[PDB]
């Protein structure tokens, strides 16, 4: 019943954990505690098998641990800066090659899976710093330029006409802009990792850079030159919606160094490069 | 028009909100979904899989596979201690195990933990070990007799190389904090020689042991938070 | 969310408007109404009652 299911949504009790049943003393030639990890399987022993348990009714739920919940939180993925210093025409617009690799926090979460399929929700938080005192009337234009479309080379480039591309115009004072994007890949899922190249020569590229091209985000201050200079920083937030993930993997253990690659750097004292805190010895807790 | 009352909260952006928004690419039809093996629907699926505990992570062993093994050998003194660690899911050395890493993305935890050990000595090497769990409210046991009074398993090494010790959820509160908190410290797990490591002549006099951990049917995490087991100290560039 | 179109007039305060507004004192229960003689429901009731005309209102 969609209404009972609805109540479960409101209470967050869609996925309930099992109860603990009462157990008793045993003397048997069946030893659940003994097994063979060599098989590659985890021994499914439960508390009732090793001690005498009481009956306990569980009220915990796994809803919050769902993939939708784990990846369904908006995090920053880019901080765009438009700093007007001495040349308005050159400093009033910019571009960014889109990717989810530049900010460690969300990158690490997505990379706990090999493939992922999801729709995206982008929310932008623009902040205009009045370097000289006043900000005037700031109007921004964010244009999505798919791979192949002409990228504007000047603040008055004809490409800004956005005759076909999707542009979002924001007016200072109005609420934060936000829109959704459908799963964009040419494949059935996004590659979080890719053990492949775009060719078979020594100079072929390796990794996700080969498969994950999402285009370019071009920004510009629509307002013409003003007396007072401003510094507009637009932070882009991304959230995954209607998510599916495949083949879980170990979490990144060392810091990231570059986009689209697993490359890392190690110091002479590797214990400083990982989160493992050195133990004094085996018996010191 | 319909009279409306704009409520507090309007216009704000909450990173955890759940609203709808117009689609920038209308009419676009996503690529057909194909079957891919290994779909994961809930993180609990990953918490139920055994991963190795870097139990021997002394400064000299870190950066070596040996940080994952405990060495056993013939003893001259009886009932000697082999190892001791905290049961707290996100404490060290449990922190970097898959379950510890995932628990670090949450604020609360509950449930029973499953610790497994695999003996790696020769087929002719025998041994009986006592694995114990000491509930909180007391210091870690100083002797086998002290440890033995708590929850424990006597492991007899034989044809089946692996044994499992279950740390039952014994707590005052239904949940505990994942981060080190005095009030919610879960206790200790110690390992002692029950008998001794015995081998025939011409057989290596030491052997290794591997340690695993995973969650039982009642394991559960709550209140999502950012992890403290990974950081970014600079820009990630192209 | 539901797309809306903010109409002219929004946000204005017209002294003769007729809107609803939240109550500052939630849960408060007003004093019981008792019978009081002489209730007036319409000003016409007062216009139908004779009153004296100051017809000889010379300055003196």
């Amino acid at each position: 019943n969609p209404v009972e299911r609805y109540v479960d949504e409101v209470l967050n009790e869609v996925l309930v954990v099992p109860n603990i049943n009462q157990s008793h003393p045993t003397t048997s030639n069946a030893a659940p505690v003994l097994d063979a990890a060599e098989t590659g399987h985890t021994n499914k022993i439960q508390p009732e098998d090793t001690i005498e348990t009481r009956y306990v009714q569980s009220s915990q739920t796994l809803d919050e641990m769902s993939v939708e919940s784990f990846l369904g939180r908006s995090g920053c993925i880019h901080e765009s800066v438009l700093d007007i210093v001495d040349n308005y025409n050159d400093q009033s617009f910019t571009k960014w090659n889109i990717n989810l690799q530049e900010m460690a926090q969300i990158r690490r979460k997505f990379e706990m899976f090999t493939y992922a399929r999801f729709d995206s929700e982008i929310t932008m938080v623009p902040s205009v710093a009045a370097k000289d005192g006043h900000i005037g009337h700031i109007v921004m234009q964010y244009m999505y330029v798919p791979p192949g479309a002409p990228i504007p080379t000047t603040r008055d480039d004809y490409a800004w006409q956005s005759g076909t591309n999707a542009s979002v115009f924001w007016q200072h004072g109005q609420p934060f802009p936000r829109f959704s994007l459908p799963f964009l890949s040419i494949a059935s899922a996004y590659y979080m990792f890719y053990d492949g190249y775009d060719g078979d020569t020594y100079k072929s590229r390796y990794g996700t850079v080969v498969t994950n091209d999402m285009g370019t985000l071009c920004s510009r201050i629509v307002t013409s030159e003003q007396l007072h200079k401003v510094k507009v920083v637009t932070r882009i937030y991304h959230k995954a919606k209607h998510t599916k993930a495949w083949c879980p993997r170990p979490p990144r253990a060392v810091q990231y160094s570059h986009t689209h690659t697993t490359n890392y750097k190690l110091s002479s004292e590797v214990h400083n490069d990982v989160a493992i805190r050195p133990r004094t010895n085996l018996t010191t807790v | 028009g319909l009279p409306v009352y704009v409520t507090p909260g309007s216009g704000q952006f909450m990173t955890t909100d759940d609203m709808q928004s117009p689609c920038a690419l209308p009419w676009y039809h996503p690529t057909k979904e194909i079957f891919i093996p290994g779909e994961v629907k809930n993180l609990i699926e990953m918490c139920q899989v055994d991963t190795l505990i870097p139990i021997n992570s002394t400064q000299s062993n870190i950066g070596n596979v040996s940080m994952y093994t405990v060495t056993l050998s013939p003893q001259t003194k009886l009932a000697e201690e082999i190892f001791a660690i905290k049961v707290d899911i996100a404490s060290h050395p449990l922190a970097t195990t898959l379950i510890g890493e995932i628990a670090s993305y949450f604020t609360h935890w509950t449930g029973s933990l499953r610790f497994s050990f695999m003996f790696c000595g020769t087929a002719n090497t025998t041994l009986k070990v006592l694995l114990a769990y000491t509930p909180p409210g007391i210091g870690k046991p100083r002797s086998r007799k002290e440890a033995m009074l708590g929850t424990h398993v006597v492991w007899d090494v034989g044809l089946q190389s692996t044994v499992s010790l279950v740390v039952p959820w014994i707590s005052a509160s239904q949940y505990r904090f994942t981060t080190p908190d005095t009030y919610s410290s879960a206790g200790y797990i110690t390992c002692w020689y029950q008998t001794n490591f015995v081998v025939p002549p011409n057989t290596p006099n030491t052997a290794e042991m591997l340690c695993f951990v995973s969650g039982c049917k009642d394991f559960c995490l709550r209140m999502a938070r950012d992890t403290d087991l990974h950081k970014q100290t600079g820009p990630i560039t192209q | 969310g539901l797309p809306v179109y903010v109409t002219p007039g929004s946000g204005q305060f017209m002294t003769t408007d007729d809107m609803q507004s939240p109550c500052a004192l939630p849960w408060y229960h007003p004093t019981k109404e008792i019978f009081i003689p002489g209730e007036v429901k319409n000003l016409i009731e007062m216009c139908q009652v004779d009153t004296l005309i100051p017809i000889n209102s010379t300055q003196s």
């Binding site: 019943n1 949504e9 996925l15 939708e68 959704s180 919606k241 209607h242 | 209308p26 | -």
Partner: peptide, 29 residues
């Protein structure tokens, strides 16, 4: 876009836009 259920406790799962990407978080299972 309205999925009207009844139980009375009526549920209105409204979809305000015409593209599936536009809807909020997915249900579970």
């Amino acid at each position: 876009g309205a999925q009207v259920s009844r139980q009375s406790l009526n549920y209105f799962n409204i979809n305000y836009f015409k593209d599936a990407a536009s809807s909020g978080a997915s249900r579970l299972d």
